[model samples]
Target: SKVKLTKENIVALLTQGKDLEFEENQNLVAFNFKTFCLENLDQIKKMSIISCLTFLKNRQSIMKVIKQSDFTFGKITIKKTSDRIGATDMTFRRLDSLIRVRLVEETGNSENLNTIKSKIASHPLIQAYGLPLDDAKSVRLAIMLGGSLPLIASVDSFEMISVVLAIYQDAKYKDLGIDPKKYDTKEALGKVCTVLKSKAFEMNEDQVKKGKEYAAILSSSNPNAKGSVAMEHYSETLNKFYEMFG
Candidate 1:
């Protein structure tokens, strides 16, 4: 008599390096297990959940590297988005992520070819050993053998200031190294409320977009509620912004 076995039992017996005696109601139910010309011997070797779990370490690191974050929390610095990108009021309705201080274009992804000669170049790293990037192959070889490469650019644009300030909140910021200290937060806010008036005169997008509706609604219902929604948003943003800086 032979033992009727499922895949688990069959693999377990075969894995222990012994002959298998199993039945398959699927096909050839009465034959020796050896009669099956199985191609996927690796099914058992590679299929064990326990084995796969142990193999997961390499994949974990790969996935982490693939999804690594480019920077820390963001900052937005825009004084405003385009007041009117044509007819659309460029309302600050959803500007939380529109902030950025982008330089990759100006820098041409600088690090890719940013390394270059300095006054110390008289030594041979730049003027002598350098090859223009036009020769991509030799230049690559030069970069490889010498363990480096070069040519650089760091330029500025006035357009950036307005754009940057408008979405400064969206800018990606990265840093940390503080020995904690204490100062007055309430006074700071109160002081901001006073000084904030100097720059707060600008009519923001909120008033621009809903000034008519809100003006009519609040004025008719409760004059005190006037400016509260807008100022409340400002207050939260101001406090939170300085909170992180401190």
Candidate 2:
């Protein structure tokens, strides 16, 4: 029997739309579907393909942002996770035994930020926008809005190294635009190392020496392998960065 369908009855009709024959099973299934749709109709209508993907991508960007947003002396500067304690050591142990080899800063102070930002912005892979991070903020967070992932925190030196390396790889080497679907964790790290070696360091001898020292230590086991020492150095470096920039 054909019943008159109204706009208010659209839900019922759509639910049963799949099985026009209208068996009891179909009716029951339709009812459940209808109920769910009725309950969430508002949200359902608001959800768009673009919006869903964007939300997911944003979450991932935030995760990276949180990790890079190291809490330093009253401030945070976007530094590689390797710059942190456990991260540096762990990277040396895993991932082909490539330690964090420090390099000299070839660029000057004024050039440092500009250079990094330029590389970051122009990278075919990075979709996040880099605004002039406020100098006053004690902890600066650089957010990439390309994914829906949440904030990422580095628990140990290895994780930190891995995370930074991963992000760098995503932003630098991949010619494909930043597609969350194509994101490769290990590849990201490899690209990160390449970018750091090429564009991260400045030409200052002191800075270069420190960078090299940092790199070598990462490459070699802390002959002393004092976990506390690693922690202490990371803490000190973070504090110093925050103090100077925060």
Candidate 3:
């Protein structure tokens, strides 16, 4: 069955929990304060999948993961520990950016949302990304679609934001996707590291280093660790990202 979406559906998803709270910013589409972290993952999962056309990555594997997931269609990358990315809208923004980046790259003249599909379909990379008998297209699409699962709402807000940023990042790529191109890997990873780092600030420098070293070790041991060795290097580096809110 086709899911008919409207502002109302979006609102229903937003209103699901009485416990969740928001700051009432008209600029922020949705905010949940219930736990300030995820406590009802079942609900979060359902909201995410529906927001696919809506949802939307850049370091080593970080940059690669973001490029692959953000630039390609339907392929999402997930790492074992605390990171996952969806690839549904990867091509949307870059193709859009090409226009803003260069006049020749500017393939379209208007901002009309209804006609973007045809304009991008005319692009070389999009065409290449799609392909002849379409094996590349099939493979890319398969990888994009095949890997990601509906994330559990039980996941922490930190992780949820990690996931959400990936979604937001990817959404920026596609037409009608969110274009938060303002943020890249350093900023994105830093947001997480900052919170954790703040939490450890009161501790002495040695204690802080110990905390990161341990996180890095656990991350390495976790087979599903994302963002490559560094994501695992979470122990070594994550506190740099999460100390603020922890």
- True lDDT of residue 138, candidate 1: 24
Q: What is the C-alpha lDDT of each candidate?
A: 0.27, 0.32, 0.30
Tell me the TM-score of model 3.
0.19
Q: Give the winner by TM-score.
A: 3
Model 2, global lDDT? 0.32
Count of residue pairs whose backbone atoms collide, per candidate: 18, 45, 41
- Candidate 3: tens digits of C-alpha lDDT, residues 13-82: 5877634333343322122222322232222334322132222211123335444442332232223322
Q: What does each candidate score in C-alpha RMSD?
A: 31.9, 22.9, 21.4
What TM-score goes with each of the models? 0.13, 0.18, 0.19
Cα deviation of 2, candidate 2, in Å: 71
lDDT by residue (tens digit), candidate 1, 195-234:
2232333446653443343222222221111234365558
lDDT of 1: 0.27
Model 2: how far residue 237 lies from native, Å: 47
